[PDB]
Design a protein around this ligand. Structure first.
Ligand SMILES: CCCCCCCCCCCCCCCCCC(=O)OC[C@H](COP(=O)([O-])OCC(O)COP(=O)([O-])OC[C@@H](COC(=O)CCCCCCCCCCCCCCCCC)OC(=O)CCCCCCCCCCCCCCCCC)OC(=O)CCCCCCCCCCCCCCCCC
Ligand SMILES: CCCCCCCCCCCCCCCCCC(=O)OC[C@H](COP(=O)([O-])OCC(O)COP(=O)([O-])OC[C@@H](COC(=O)CCCCCCCCCCCCCCCCC)OC(=O)CCCCCCCCCCCCCCCCC)OC(=O)CCCCCCCCCCCCCCCCC
Ligand SMILES: CCCCCCCCCCCCCCCCCC(=O)OC[C@H](COP(=O)([O-])OCC(O)COP(=O)([O-])OC[C@@H](COC(=O)CCCCCCCCCCCCCCCCC)OC(=O)CCCCCCCCCCCCCCCCC)OC(=O)CCCCCCCCCCCCCCCCC
Ligand SMILES: CCCCCCCCCCCCCCCCCC(=O)OC[C@H](COP(=O)([O-])OCC(O)COP(=O)([O-])OC[C@@H](COC(=O)CCCCCCCCCCCCCCCCC)OC(=O)CCCCCCCCCCCCCCCCC)OC(=O)CCCCCCCCCCCCCCCCC
Ligand SMILES: CCCCCCCCCCCCCCCCCC(=O)OC[C@H](COP(=O)([O-])OCC[N+](C)(C)C)OC(=O)CCCCCCCCCCCCCCCCC
Ligand SMILES: CCCCCCCCCCCCCCCCCC(=O)OC[C@H](COP(=O)(O)OCCN)OC(=O)CCCCCCCCCCCCCCCCC
Ligand SMILES: CCCCCCCCCCCCCCCCCC(=O)OC[C@H](COP(=O)(O)OCCN)OC(=O)CCCCCCCCCCCCCCCCC
Ligand SMILES: CCCCCCCCCCCCCCCCCC(=O)OC[C@H](COP(=O)(O)OCCN)OC(=O)CCCCCCCCCCCCCCCCC
Lengths: 98, 345, 54, 140, 120, 52, 63, 459, 64
């Protein structure tokens, strides 16, 4: 369990690093967000199963529900961005500096 | 927007911070944050222009990343202590990650780079809703864990927030960007007084809200997004120049306005806790904030910029736009300094 | 003194310093890639500060 | 580096000038690395070559400022036999400001840096002499 | 800091212990200034709505003054209760820990030697 | 919580599953139920600082 | 009215201000002591609620 | 004090409710009555201080400043009611409201018994003079002048607020009498030196000290006449009053910490008198003369001698009166010829004989002609400075010589000489402005007749 | 008008820092201050030394 939890924490750290280090693809950024979500789910689930906290077992499902709402809104915003520009380029999303 | 979706979106916008403030569980506080973000995105992108799309996208990814870091802190605390609240012995790394993610959600420097850009490109009422309502729930989360936070990191975040807010407000001419950097500076003050006395954090938050609301309403009177646009206000609404000047001076913290009271009492509490260097640096950067406010006052009220020919037709037309709640908030944000012992607790 | 050097010393030098600082701080490119790279630098610096403070 | 910067203060001023200069150069180099990282992240260069050139220039400038600061402060303390004197730190801060102006090629920047950094260093020496807390824990 | 005190009712505006406090005098400068602020709010609202400043909307001005005085009275009573309970807790803690608050003996100006600094 | 609406109304929306020793389905005791019960029984009523 | 009115008014004012100063210093000391070692009404940081703990017999007897 | 504060407060509803054809008359008459009421603070038949309430008190130092403020309000109205005839009614009433608010806040500031209230009213007085200068000033540079004035004062006053909160935390009440009785001697550390500088630099900025005096000439030039009057006659004296009030708890390290400021004051009064000798602007000349006189006041307060304090108080009152009079005469010439050039109008003695008499009397007051209170203050300041060090008499003598030189140069170049006959628009005289000159000169004569009123705290 | 503007408002726009005027400004702003500082410091130190050792007689100086 502690080695597994350390590996899951490092997986979250890598997914957060990917989110913070942008490339050209907003879809890839959203995928990094979903990877962070997946790492959080696995950490919460193994913690609940290790501590036998059946009362806290609804919490990972709630995490999945709200994170899927987040991903849904992100896809809708990516639809709007692609309708504006033709691509999902964060380099195109830059005209609010002035 | 049909009234059904207006009611749904506005009720969820209201319900987010309410759930966050009323929730004992960290997970329910987090889902209140999720409610606030998800519900406020469509009203940000409601005008359906490229700038609004960019603002909604930037706000979404910033708040989503910060909420993921919050969720990491919550899950790590649940792993360490088996509970759903940072009680007393949660790890300092967990608490610092919570503080950092909540500061990125709040929009204070050096996590402030999105806030003037998100505030730009959205309509004025949505800028008001953002800069007032969206900061209550993260501040409530920070207030609930005030004895656990790290004073060094909090003071560093606060001082860089006030510095960057002062410099950004000094540079910008767009009114939304000016209000956003004002928000950054005042959030810096609130964070500075957070670990010592959260009652003063709430006091400064309430003073900032009742000062920010009528300034945004006065901007909403004519959709004046620019210094020049607010400068020709003497031809459009000449009766609002005095209240504009008084509210901007109150935002500057000049006595005897009631906006001097939050900075004054925060400085007093910091002096009681022996952080004189931080208090003095914050006060000097507040003077810089007052400088860009004073330049705004010079543009709109004390001088009279040249007007247009169609402003004659605008004076021919009549308006009913300033609501009943504008003057109450303006007076309560202007002339309430003698009630300072009642305003503090 | 008055029309040259006291002005050069206190008020104009203060205004010049703050104008340079506000240009340097508001010289942003408006790119969220750069903003998030800055946020990553902030995260690393906070972790380093916590690790050295203990 | 915490115990490093604490080993800056384990010896009184005017003694171990090489150690004090080394510690101040290290602190200036760390500050220059942080500033250069922020600079290349917010305002990226055209290529990696000029990016690392800017990083090296900023790091060397800040390291030279710190080295000149520590060297001049310890030298002034040695020659005036006053380890607990804020004027030594003012002289060192003015020397660091002159180093900044020499690196930036501007006499006006040199003078402004001299005055501001000398005042900051004098205030720091006063604070370390009279027990000021920069980030105090909440007491009341 | 006073939210965690024993006997703290949650989200209670005026608890029953506040009934022990003397009420505000109802003609006192704080409430008079609150009514003045309400009247000024009414006048400013008229001027911003481009009405006559004083002779228009008398019912509106009366409602502004009345609401300001009413809210100010109840808020002032709450703040008086809060300051009273703050002083009560402070005095009780001082009485509970007298060894941390010793009565220092102030000597007269005949045994202490103040240094004299001549101005010349 | 920042607002005590649950304590004022007497309801428990989330207060009954805040820890391992809370209400559990079919009386399945979590791990360290006794230890967490002892910790909460000790820490109750004395405040955070005295509890630590 | 004469000098005694102003004299005794000044005495009353000085008594009020000296009492206020002593009270403010005592309040600072009280706040510092309570924050250092919270045992009075103030600075009582929260604690998980005792009434939400199961005490009924459970499936596993070793609880 | 409330019997002076309350009707001055009621002046504002009088201003906003009076008819537009009666506003100036009503406000001027009731402000004169306010000054007459304020004269009751001179009833001091005892060594005690008139502590009226828990937050208001009267002093032998505070009383002349309060009376001068209440006297200057109707004079400001009379001075300013000519350049507002081609002005909107609501703007005229707003200007009168600004003047009345200045008078109210200055009276409260001088009568304050608590230093935090003193600082709050300090900034409260900072606001409406900035509004007056920025809104009703004439040239383009009024905005820069207002910024300079506002931020010199603010950067001065912020460490004053920090120092006041520190002293309040250390002592407990920040009440003036409590501090005066339970004063503790500082141990002369670097922290106490910084505390001293923090609590003195705000007042030194507003005095103004030399080197930081740059806000004053442009503010006085760009200000309207009432703003120049209130500035040069009350606000510098407000800085001096703050210095006298706060200096009681700074013993003993003011003895050596006063050294740079005394040198700055003496050499700055010499430099500013030289600028008056070579100055092409009449209002700038009057402003730099004010800088030199306030430098004398700074030096007296720094050396902390009873003779110095008395001379400081007398010079404060005398310089306020004569500087307001000089500004009013210069404004009369400015409303005539629409210029502030020193050399443009020359032979005004021919056309304006009685105004030339007022000019001559104002300048003789400026160069401290005996037995006026100007010479009383300057002479006792010189006596105390010579007691402090015998070599200060050289700087004092040079300053006196240049003072007489620039005053008589002003008289000769503005009144004497051949008349500039091209100035066809020389209206003879206004009874209003002649009355204004008389209402400045007569209190100088009366205070010369009885100088015991303005001696101050020490004697 | 040109003469007044050149004497008042044009000087700082047309001022450029050179080493000569920097040296002149430093001398004219500090040298008198340092000179009178040393004069007054020497005089007051001598006076205080004489008063502390009693060698200075105050005949009738009662109001200083
Ligand atoms: C009196 C003072 C307070 C007045 C408040 C109301 C202000 C107002 O509406 O004025 C307009 C109105 C006059 O308007 P009007 O001429 O009739 O017609 C409207 C115009 O046509 C309208 O023309 P327009 O709209 O086309 O264009 C005009 C416009 C054009 O715009 C401009 O000209 C722009 C000007 C920009 C520069 C000014 C910026 C703001 C400066 C504010 C002050 C700062 C300095 C002061 C010190 C710091 C303060 C924080 O505005 C102006 O010219 C100025 C408008 C506001 C003027 C009044 C300002 C009041 C606040 C400031 C002074 C008082 C407080 C400070 C002093 C306190 C004491 C020391 O004022 C009044 O009627 C005043 C009230 C008079 C009656 C008082 C009766 C009291 C009765 C008490 C008993 C009953 C109640 C009992 C309650 C308790 C029961 C228990
Ligand atoms: C404090 C805790 C303990 C220590 C911890 C470790 C050290 C922390 C150091 C913190 C202070 C330095 C921070 C630097 C930030 C970046 C500045 C910069 O270069 O921006 C350019 C960059 C734009 O670059 P660019 O477009 O290429 O511009 C070209 C230049 O114009 C081209 O101009 P140039 O050719 O002149 O370039 C030469 C370059 C060479 O300079 C450098 O490379 C940086 C040197 C900085 C030295 C300052 C500290 C010196 C300390 C000496 C200590 C001596 C011993 C101790 C005794 C005495 C103590 C006083 O100079 C600059 O770039 C100057 C930039 C402005 C600096 C303003 C500093 C103000 C505060 C000073 C006191 C602190 O601007 C930005 O990125 C603006 C946004 C900034 C975002 C970050 C905001 C937070 C920064 C502070 C973080 C503090 C710690 C974390 C707090 C919590 C965070 C979550
Ligand atoms: C016509 C208008 C007035 C109609 C009044 C009708 C009602 C009536 O007859 O009331 C009698 C009622 C009888 O009084 P009382 O209950 O026997 O006690 C009087 C004692 O002297 C006890 O009074 P106290 O002296 O203990 O005062 C209570 C205390 C607490 O009272 C207050 O805080 C009220 C302060 C009002 C001003 O006052 C203070 O702490 C004074 C603070 C002063 C510094 C404030 C600094 C901020 C700037 C100036 C004030 C704000 C003005 C607007 C903003 C513009 C600034 C330039 O008199 C009053 O309420 C006095 C005030 C009335 C005028 C208010 C201001 C106008
Ligand atoms: C060690 C090895 C190197 C030795 C060395 O290079 O010595 C020469 C070097 C001066 O360089 P330089 O030969 O004049 O260079 C002329 C350029 O090549 C040719 O000149 P340029 O026209 O091409 O350059 C334009 C302008 C560039 O623009 C500027 O320099 C702007 C003005 C900078 C400040 C000037 C201060 C002096 C005037 C004060 C006036 C009164 C103020 C109120 C009282 O340059 C200058 O004005 C030249 C003089 C620069 C002096 C820099 C002094 C830096 C340290 C200042 C310390 C604090 C001063 C007091 C501050 C008080 C604050 C309350 O140092 C000295 O002569 C020793 C004094 C060093 C400072 C103490
Ligand atoms: C108008 C002039 C403005 C500039 C000069 C202002 C005054 C300069 C000297 C004072 C230092 C700065 C103000 C400090 C205010 C508080 C003083 C105090 O309480 O001292 C005791 C305290 C010490 O606290 P203490 O007294 O409790 O000390 C404890 C001592 N023991 C432990 C022995 C009991 O001093 C400080 O805290 C001073 C820290 C200052 C750090 C910040 C300085 C910033 C820069 C200042 C100037 C900025 C404006 C000008 C910019 C340039 C314009 C050209
Ligand atoms: C002692 C005073 C040191 C002043 C150092 C400084 O900042 O000088 C600024 C100056 C700017 O460089 P610049 O004007 O281009 O001329 C270089 C010619 N040596 O830079 C220099 O003159 C730098 C010269 C080398 C370093 C000298 C120390
Ligand atoms: C904590 C520590 C904080 C340190 C903060 C300061 C850091 C060092 C100084 C940075 C200055 C940045 C701006 C600058 O360079 O200003 C110099 C200014 C313009 O000179 P220029 O030759 O144009 O230089 C190019 C502009 N960078 O040059 C001028 O305006 C010339 C000014 C000459 C006289 C200056 C005298 C001192 C002024 C301040 C007195 C304070 C008391
Ligand atoms: C219209 C407003 C109607 C208000 C009705 C009463 C609301 C209420 O219950 O207020 C109680 C509230 C919280 O009281 P408490 O238990 O001390 O909670 C600490 C949180 N700061 O008390 C407070 O929040 C006190 C401060 C209220 C300030 C209201 C005006 C701003």
């Amino acid at each position: 369990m502690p080695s597994t939890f350390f590996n899951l924490t490092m997986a979250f750290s890598l997914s957060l690093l990917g989110t913070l280090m942008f490339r050209s693809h907003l879809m890839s950024t959203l995928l990094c967000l979903e990877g962070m979500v997946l790492s959080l789910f696995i950490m919460t689930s193994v913690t609940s199963l290790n501590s036998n906290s059946m009362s806290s077992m609804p919490i990972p499902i709630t995490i999945l529900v709200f994170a899927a709402c987040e991903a849904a809104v992100g896809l809708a915003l990516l639809v709007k961005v692609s309708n504006t520009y033709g691509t999902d380029y964060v380099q195109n999303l830059n005209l609010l500096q002035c | 927007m049909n009234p059904i979706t207006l009611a749904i979106i506005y009720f969820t916008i209201f319900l987010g911070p309410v759930i966050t403030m009323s929730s004992t569980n960290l997970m329910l506080m987090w889902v209140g944050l999720e409610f606030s973000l998800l519900a406020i995105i469509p009203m940000l992108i409601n005008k359906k222009n490229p700038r609004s799309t960019e603002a909604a996208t930037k706000y979404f990814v910033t708040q989503a990343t910060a909420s993921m870091i919050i969720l990491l802190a919550i899950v790590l605390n649940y792993k360490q202590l088996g509970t759903w609240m940072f009680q007393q012995q949660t790890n300092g790394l967990i608490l610092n990650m919570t503080l950092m993610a909540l500061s990125m959600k709040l929009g204070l420097a050096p996590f402030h780079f999105w806030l003037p850009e998100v505030t730009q490109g959205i309509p004025l009422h949505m800028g008001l809703i953002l800069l007032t309502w969206q900061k209550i729930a993260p501040l409530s989360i920070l207030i609930q864990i005030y004895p656990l936070l790290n004073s060094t990191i909090i003071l560093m975040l606060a001082i860089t927030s006030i510095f960057m807010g002062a410099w950004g407000g000094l540079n910008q001419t767009q009114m939304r960007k000016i209000m956003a950097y004002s928000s950054i500076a005042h959030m810096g003050w609130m964070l500075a007084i957070l670990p010592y006395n959260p009652s003063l954090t709430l006091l400064n938050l309430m003073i900032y809200i009742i000062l920010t609301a009528p300034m945004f309403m006065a901007l909403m009177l004519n959709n004046s997004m620019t210094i020049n646009s607010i400068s020709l206000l003497w031809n459009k609404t000449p009766a609002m120049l005095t209240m504009i000047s008084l509210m901007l001076l109150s935002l500057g913290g000049l006595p005897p306005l009631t906006g001097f009271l939050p900075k004054w009492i925060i400085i007093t509490e910091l002096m009681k806790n022996n952080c004189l260097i931080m208090a003095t640096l914050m006060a000097m950067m507040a003077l810089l904030n007052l400088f860009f406010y004073t330049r705004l006052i010079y543009s709109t009220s004390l001088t009279m910029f040249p007007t247009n020919n169609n402003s004659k037709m605008m004076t021919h037309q009549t308006k009913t736009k300033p609501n009943l709640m504008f003057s109450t908030l303006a007076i309560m944000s202007t002339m309430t300094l003698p009630l300072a012992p009642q305003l503090i607790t | 003194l008055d029309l040259i050097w006291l002005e050069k010393t206190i008020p104009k030098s203060t205004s010049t310093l703050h104008t340079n600082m506000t240009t340097l701080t508001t010289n942003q490119k408006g790119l969220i890639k750069l903003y998030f790279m800055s946020f990553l630098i902030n995260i690393i610096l906070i972790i380093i500060l916590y690790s050295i403070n203990l | 580096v915490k115990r490093f910067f604490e080993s800056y203060h384990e010896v009184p001023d005017g003694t171990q000038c090489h150690r004090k200069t080394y510690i101040t150069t290290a602190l200036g180099g760390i500050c220059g690395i942080i500033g250069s990282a922020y600079s290349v992240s917010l305002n990226p260069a055209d290529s990696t070559l000029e990016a690392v050139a800017r990083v090296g220039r900023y790091t060397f400038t800040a390291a030279a400022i710190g080295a000149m600061f520590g060297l001049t402060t310890c030298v002034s303390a040695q020659v005036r036999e006053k380890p607990d004197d804020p004027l030594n730190y003012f002289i060192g801060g003015c020397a660091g400001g002159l180093t900044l102006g020499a690196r930036t090629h501007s006499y006006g920047t040199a003078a402004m840096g001299c005055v501001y950094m000398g005042t900051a260093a004098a205030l720091f020496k006063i604070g370390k002499l009279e027990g000021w807390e920069l980030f105090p824990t909440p007491k009341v | 800091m006073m939210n965690g005190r024993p006997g703290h009712e949650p989200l209670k505006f005026l608890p029953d212990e506040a009934r022990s406090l003397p009420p505000p005098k109802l003609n006192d400068p704080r409430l008079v200034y609150m009514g003045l602020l309400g009247y000024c709010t009414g006048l400013m609202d008229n001027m911003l709505r481009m009405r006559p400043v004083m002779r228009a909307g008398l019912h509106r001005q009366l409602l502004f003054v009345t609401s300001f005085v009413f809210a100010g009275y109840f808020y002032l009573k709450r703040q008086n209760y809060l300051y009273a309970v703050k002083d009560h807790d402070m005095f009780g803690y001082i009485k509970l820990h007298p060894e941390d608050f010793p009565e220092k003996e102030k000597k007269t100006y005949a045994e202490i030697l103040e240094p004299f600094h001549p101005v010349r | 919580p920042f607002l005590d609406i649950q304590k004022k109304l007497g309801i428990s929306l989330d207060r009954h599953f805040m820890f391992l020793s809370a209400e559990q389905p079919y009386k399945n005791a979590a791990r360290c139920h006794a230890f967490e019960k002892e910790w909460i029984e000790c820490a109750h009523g004395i405040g955070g600082t005295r509890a630590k | 009215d004469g000098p005694e009115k102003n004299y005794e008014k000044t005495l009353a004012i000085l008594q009020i201000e000296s009492e206020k100063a002593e009270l403010r210093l005592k309040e600072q000391e009280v706040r510092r002591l309570m924050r250092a070692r919270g045992d009075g009404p103030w600075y009582q940081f929260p604690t998980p609620e005792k009434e939400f703990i199961d005490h009924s017999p459970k499936a596993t007897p070793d609880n | 004090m409330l019997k002076i504060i309350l009707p001055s407060l009621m002046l504002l509803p009088l201003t906003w409710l009076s008819s537009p054809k009666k506003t100036w008359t009503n406000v001027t008459s009731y402000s004169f009555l306010i000054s007459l009421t304020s004269l009751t603070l001179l009833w001091q038949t005892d060594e005690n201080y008139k502590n009226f309430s828990n937050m208001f008190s009267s002093d032998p130092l505070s009383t002349p400043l309060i009376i001068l403020t209440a006297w200057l309000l109707p004079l400001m109205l009379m001075a300013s009611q000519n350049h507002l005839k081609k002005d909107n009614n609501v703007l005229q009433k707003l200007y009168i409201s600004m003047l009345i608010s200045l008078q109210i806040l200055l009276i409260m500031t001088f009568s304050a018994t608590e230093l935090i209230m003193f600082y709050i009213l300090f900034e409260a007085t900072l606001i409406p003079t900035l509004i007056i200068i920025t809104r009703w000033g004439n040239q383009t540079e009024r905005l820069n002048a207002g910024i300079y004035f506002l931020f010199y004062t603010l950067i001065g006053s912020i460490p004053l607020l920090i120092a006041l909160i520190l002293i309040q935390n250390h002592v407990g009440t920040l009440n003036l009498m409590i501090l005066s009785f339970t004063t503790h001697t500082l141990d002369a550390s670097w922290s106490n030196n910084l505390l001293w500088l923090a609590c003195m630099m705000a007042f030194l900025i507003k005095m103004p000290l030399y080197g930081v005096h740059l806000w004053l000439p442009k503010a006085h030039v760009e200000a309207p006449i009432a703003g120049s009057m209130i500035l040069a006659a009350i606000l510098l004296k407000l800085g001096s009053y703050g210095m006298i009030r706060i200096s009681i708890i700074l013993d003993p390290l003011t003895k050596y910490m006063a050294y740079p400021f005394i040198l700055l004051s003496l050499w700055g009064m010499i430099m500013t008198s030289s600028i008056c000798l070579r100055q092409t602007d009449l209002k700038s000349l009057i402003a730099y003369s004010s800088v030199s006189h306030m430098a004398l006041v700074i030096a007296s307060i720094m050396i902390q001698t009873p003779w110095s304090f008395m001379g400081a108080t007398m010079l404060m009152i005398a310089h306020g009166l004569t500087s307001s009079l000089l500004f009013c005469l210069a404004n009369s010439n400015y409303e005539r010829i629409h210029s502030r050039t020193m050399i443009m109008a020359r032979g005004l003695q021919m056309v304006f004989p009685l105004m030339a008499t007022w000019w001559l009397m104002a300048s003789l007051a400026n160069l401290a002609l005996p037995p006026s209170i100007n010479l009383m203050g300057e002479l006792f300041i010189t006596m105390s400075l010579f007691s402090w060090s015998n070599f200060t008499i050289i700087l004092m003598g040079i300053n006196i010589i240049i003072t007489g030189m620039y005053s008589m140069y002003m008289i000769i170049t503005t009144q004497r000489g051949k008349l500039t006959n091209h100035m066809i628009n020389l209206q003879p005289s206004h009874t209003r402005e002649l009355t204004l000159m008389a209402l400045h000169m007569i209190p100088l004569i009366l205070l010369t007749t009885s100088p015991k009123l303005i001696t101050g705290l020490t004697m | 008008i040109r003469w007044t503007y050149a004497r008042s408002a044009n000087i700082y726009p047309n001022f450029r820092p050179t080493p000569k005027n920097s040296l002149l400004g430093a001398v004219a702003g500090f040298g008198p201050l340092i000179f009178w500082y040393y004069v007054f410091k020497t005089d007051r130190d001598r006076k205080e030394r004489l008063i502390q050792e009693g060698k200075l007689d105050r005949k009738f100086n009662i109001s200083y």
